[PDB]
Amino acid sequence: HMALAAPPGELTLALTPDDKTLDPASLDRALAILAEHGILVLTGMLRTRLTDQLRTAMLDDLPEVLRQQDVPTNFVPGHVQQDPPVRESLLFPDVLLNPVVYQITHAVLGADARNAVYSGNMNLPGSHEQPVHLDEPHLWPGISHPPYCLCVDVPLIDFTLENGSTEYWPGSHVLNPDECYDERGCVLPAELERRRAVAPPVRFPIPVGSVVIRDGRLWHRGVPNLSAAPRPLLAMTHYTEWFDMPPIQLPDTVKSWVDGSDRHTHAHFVAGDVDHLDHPFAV
Amino acid sequence: ALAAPPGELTLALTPDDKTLDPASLDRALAILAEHGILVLTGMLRTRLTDQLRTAMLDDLPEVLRQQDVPTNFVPGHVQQDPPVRESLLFPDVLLNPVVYQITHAVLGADARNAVYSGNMNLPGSHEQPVHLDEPHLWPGISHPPYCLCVDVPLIDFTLENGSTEYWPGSHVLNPDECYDERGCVLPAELERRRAVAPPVRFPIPVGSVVIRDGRLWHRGVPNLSAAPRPLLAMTHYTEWFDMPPIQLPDTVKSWVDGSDRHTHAHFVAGDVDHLTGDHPF
Ligand SMILES: NC[C@H]1O[C@H](O[C@H]2[C@H](O)[C@@H](O)[C@H](N)C[C@@H]2N)[C@H](N)[C@@H](O)[C@@H]1O
Ligand SMILES: NC[C@H]1O[C@H](O[C@H]2[C@H](O)[C@@H](O)[C@H](N)C[C@@H]2N)[C@H](N)[C@@H](O)[C@@H]1O
Ligand SMILES: O=C(O)CNC(=O)C(=O)O
Ligand SMILES: O=C(O)CNC(=O)C(=O)O
Ligand code: NI
Ligand code: NI
C-alpha cells in the first residue's frame, strides 16, 4: 500500500460548509473522479457543531454496544457495526439530506436515487486488518455495468494512518472478472496481486468535516487502529430506486422534513423512539 | 402472421416433462439469449388451464363493474389478477420445475416470482402501442436480463383472438431516447428496428408457457373473436430487483415458502381480495 500525508489532489474537492451546490465545472470533475477512481474526498463540508454531537453520541453509546452478548463485527476483531442514534435531536438535514452529496448521487444514479443506510463503523484500539472486500457486489458475474450505489462515509474524528483511516483501491470499482468475489464480498487473492501491480492501494488522513463518496463496489479494507481512542465513522449508501433494500427505521418526529424532500430516503417512520442498539449490515 | 409457433423459438414438451436434459436446456437458453422469447408447448394439463380459464371468465363481471376499469394503454385490454384461493393455486403454475430450471440458469438460484396477474383481451379491443413491460436499468447501456415474463394462455391463442405480437431480438436494444415514461418504443426506433428484424405473431395452443425477457418489445392486438382471451402472467426477477410482494393466503404458505423455487410473497390470514387489493392488512 501507498501511505500518503494528505488526501491526494486527483481524488479531492475542497469545499466550505457554505457551498450548497457545485458549479458545473466542479460537478464535472466530481463525476470524472467517481467514474475513473471510484472514490471522491470532499473536504470542509460539515460544521464541527454537527460532527462534535455525532462523535459524542456514538462514543457515549459504545459501552452499551460492547456490553451485548454478541457484538456485531465486520470480518475481524475491532471493526464494530454501530448505528448512530436516530433521536430527532441528532438527525441533521446537512448529514441525511446533504445538498452537495445528493447533487452528485442524482447525477450518477438518477433523481430517484435514495439513501437506504444510516449506520456506522466503530474501529476499536487494537483492531485487526480486514480482508479486502466490496460492500455491495456487481449485479452479474463477468459483466461491466455502471454504478447502482454510492457509499457516503462521514468521519467523526480526524482519520490518520495511526487510528485506522480506510485503505482504498482506486479504479477497482469496474473490475468484475469471473470467480473474483466470495459470498462475503472478499476479493480473491490472485486478483488482489494482479491489481496491486497496476494500481496499488492508498491510505491517507481525512480531516473531520470531510465526506467520502465512493462506488459501493470499490475494493477497500478496515485496518488496525493503533491509537488509544475508538475511530467512529457514520455511513450512508445511496442506491438506484430499483435496488431492493430494507428501509431505515426513523422516528415520525422527522417525517415532516425527510418524507417531503426531493432527496429521497427509503425510510419507515415509527411512533416514538427506534432502538438503534444482531445487525443486518455486519459481515 | 404464421400458422404455428416458429421452430426457432419453440420447444415441444408434455406435462410429464419435469426437467430438460442439458442439450434441451442449452437450446432454450440460446433462444432466450438471441430472440428474447421462448415458446414451450404442451407444458400444462388442460385440468389446470380449464379451472383458471373458468375462474377468470367468472370474475370478469366484478372487474367490468368497477368505476374505472384497469386498462393497458387502449380499450379492451383489461388488467385482471387470477384468484389466489388455495383451490386455484397450482404448484405446476406458480412453481413450474421447467420454468424455474430456465429462470435459475438465466437469473440465478435466488431469482423469485413477484407477479401473479393477468390480461383479459375483450372482443373488439384496440391495438396497443409497442412497449416493454420492464425497462432497462440505465439509459443507453447494454446489460444482461434481470427479469423473465412467464405468460400462460388460458385458451388457444389465434391470429383472430389476439395472440400477442413479439419483436424478436428487441430485448437487447437500449439506445438513448428509445422509451417514453410508459415503456412505449419511440416511433423512429420502431421503424429502424422493423427494417432489420420485423415482428411476428403466431397461434399458441393452450397448455403452452411463453418465457420472454421482460424488456422484449411486444403489443396486445385486437381480439376479433366472440370470446374474451384470458392470459395469466408471472414475472421472475433477480433477488436484488425491488418489487412489492404477491399477497397469498397462509393456507399455501406450507408449499410456497418451503420451495427452492422462490416467490416474493406476503402470507395473509384468511382470503385475499385479488381484484381490488382492498383486504384490511
Ligand atoms: N459502507 C456502508 C456499510 O457497507 C457494508 O454493509 C453493507 C453490506 O455489505 C451489504 O451486504 C448490505 N446489503 C448493506 C450493508 N450496508 C459494511 N459491511 C458495513 O459495515 C458498512 O457500514
Ligand atoms: N407481463 C406481465 C405484466 O407486465 C406489465 O405489468 C408490469 C409493469 O409494466 C411494470 O412497470 C411493473 N414494474 C410490473 C408490472 N407487472 C403489464 N402492464 C401487465 O398487464 C402484465 O400482466
Ligand atoms: O470502518 C472502516 O474503516 C472500514 N470498514 C469496512 O469496510 C467494513 O467494516 O465493511
Ligand atoms: O395481452 C397481450 O397480448 C399483451 N398485453 C400487454 O403486453 C400489456 O398489457 O402489457
Ligand atoms: Ni467495507
Ligand atoms: Ni405488455
Q: Give me B278's grid cell.
A: 382492498
Is the shortest distance between the CB of A58 and ligand 1 below 6 Å?
no
CA A177, CA A144: separation in Å to the nearest integer?
Answer: 9
Residue that is written with C-alpha cell 430485448 in the block: B171
CA B127, CA B129: separation in Å to the nearest integer?
Answer: 7
Residue B172's region, left for phi above 0, alpha for psi from -120 to 50, else beta, is: alpha
CB < 8 Å to A149, chain B = none
Is the shortest distance between the CB of A151 and ligand 3 below 6 Å?
no
Q: Give me A187's grid cell.
A: 476479493
Nearest CB partner across the interface for A243, out of B138, B143, B240: B240
CB < 8 Å to A143, chain B = 143-144
Q: What b/e sequence results for B198-215 when a residue is b if at least 16 CB atoms lie within 10 Å of its CB, and e otherwise?
A: ebbbbbbebbbbbbbbbb
Mutate to test the interface with B, among A135, A140, A148, A266 (most CBs of B within 10 A): A140
CA B189, CA A111: separation in Å to the nearest integer?
Answer: 25
Residue B79's region, left for phi above 0, alpha for psi from -120 to 50, else beta, is: beta
Backbone angles phi, psi at A159, to 5 degrees: -90, 135
User: What's the CA-to-centroid distance between A109 and ligand 5, angstroms?
Assistant: 20
Nearest CA to ligand 3 atom 8: A74
Mutate to test the interface with A, among B112, B137, B215 (most CBs of A within 10 A): B137
Dihedral of the alpha carbons of A258, A262, A268, A272, in degrees to the nearest 10: 10
Least distant ligand from the CA of B79: 2
CB < 8 Å to A242, chain B = 137, 241-242
Nearest CB partner across the interface for A143, out of B144, B238, B242: B144
Question: Which range of residues forms the domain containing residue A122?
Answer: 2-270
CA B230, CA B162: separation in Å to the nearest integer?
Answer: 10
CB < 8 Å to B241, chain A = 242-244
What's the first-to-final CA gap in chain A, in angstroms? 24
B106, part of any domain: yes
CA A11, CA A38: separation in Å to the nearest integer?
Answer: 9
Number of structural domains in chain A: 1
CA A157, CA A229: separation in Å to the nearest integer?
Answer: 10
B91, part of any domain: yes
Are B150 and B233 in contact, with CB atoms under 8 Å apart? yes
Q: Which of A153, A198, A193, A203 is nearest to A4 (CA)?
A: A203
What SS3 class is residue B161? coil
Are B171 and B147 in contact, with CB atoms under 8 Å apart? no
CA B272, CA B281: separation in Å to the nearest integer?
Answer: 10
Nearest CB partner across the interface for A242, out of B137, B143, B144: B137
Q: Give me B156's grid cell.
A: 388457444
B278, part of any domain: no
- Sign, CA dihedral A244-A248-A253-A257, equals negative
Q: Which of B143, B141, B162, B219 is nearest to B185 (CA)?
A: B219
Which of B74, B126, B128, B155 is the best mutation target for the ligand 4 pocket, counting ligand atoms within 8 Å of the beta carbon and taking the most?
B128
CB < 8 Å to B137, chain A = 145, 148, 240, 242
Instruction: Name the residue of chain B whose CA is nearest to A245's CA.
Output: B242
Nearest CB partner across the interface for B241, out of A140, A143, A242: A242
Is the shortest distance between the CB of A81 and ligand 3 below 6 Å?
no
CA A163, CA A127: separation in Å to the nearest integer?
Answer: 10
- Say yes or no for a CB contact (<8 Å) between B243 and A245: no
Is the shortest distance between the CB of A225 and ligand 3 below 6 Å?
no
Instruction: Name the residue of chain A whose CA is nearest to B264's CA.
Output: A244
CA B84, CA B277: separation in Å to the nearest integer?
Answer: 11
CA A144, CA B204: separation in Å to the nearest integer?
Answer: 37
Method: X-ray
The CATH code of the domain that includes A207 is 2.60.120.620
Contacts of B214 (CB under 8 A, 6+ apart): B132, B133, B134, B145, B146, B147, B148, B149, B235
Q: Which of B224, B195, B205, B211 is nearest to B3 (CA)?
A: B205
Q: Which atom of ligand 1 is nearest to the CA of A79?
A: 20
B225, part of any domain: yes
Q: Which of A124, A114, A148 is nearest to A134 (CA)?
A: A148
Element (H, E) at B104: helix B97-107
Q: What is the DSSP letter of B131?
A: B
Q: Where are the beta strands (DSSP E) in chain A?
A: 2-3, 12-14, 39-43, 79-81, 114-123, 149-155, 167-168, 202-203, 211-215, 220-221, 231-239, 248-251, 264-265, 267-270
Nearest CB partner across the interface for B242, out of A139, A140, A244: A244
- Say yes or no for a CB contact (<8 Å) between A242 and B242: yes
Nearest CA to ligand 3 atom 10: A74
Q: What is the DSSP letter of A143?
A: -
Amino acid at A197: A
**A24-37 and A99-109 are packed helices; what angle lies between their axes, rounded to 10 degrees?**
60
Nearest CA to ligand 3 atom 5: A222
Q: Which of A214, A254, A206, A268 is nearest to A237 (CA)?
A: A214
Is the shortest distance between the CB of A233 and ligand 3 below 6 Å?
yes
- Please give all residues whose CB falls under 5 A of ion ligand 5, grouped by chain where several chains appear: A 135
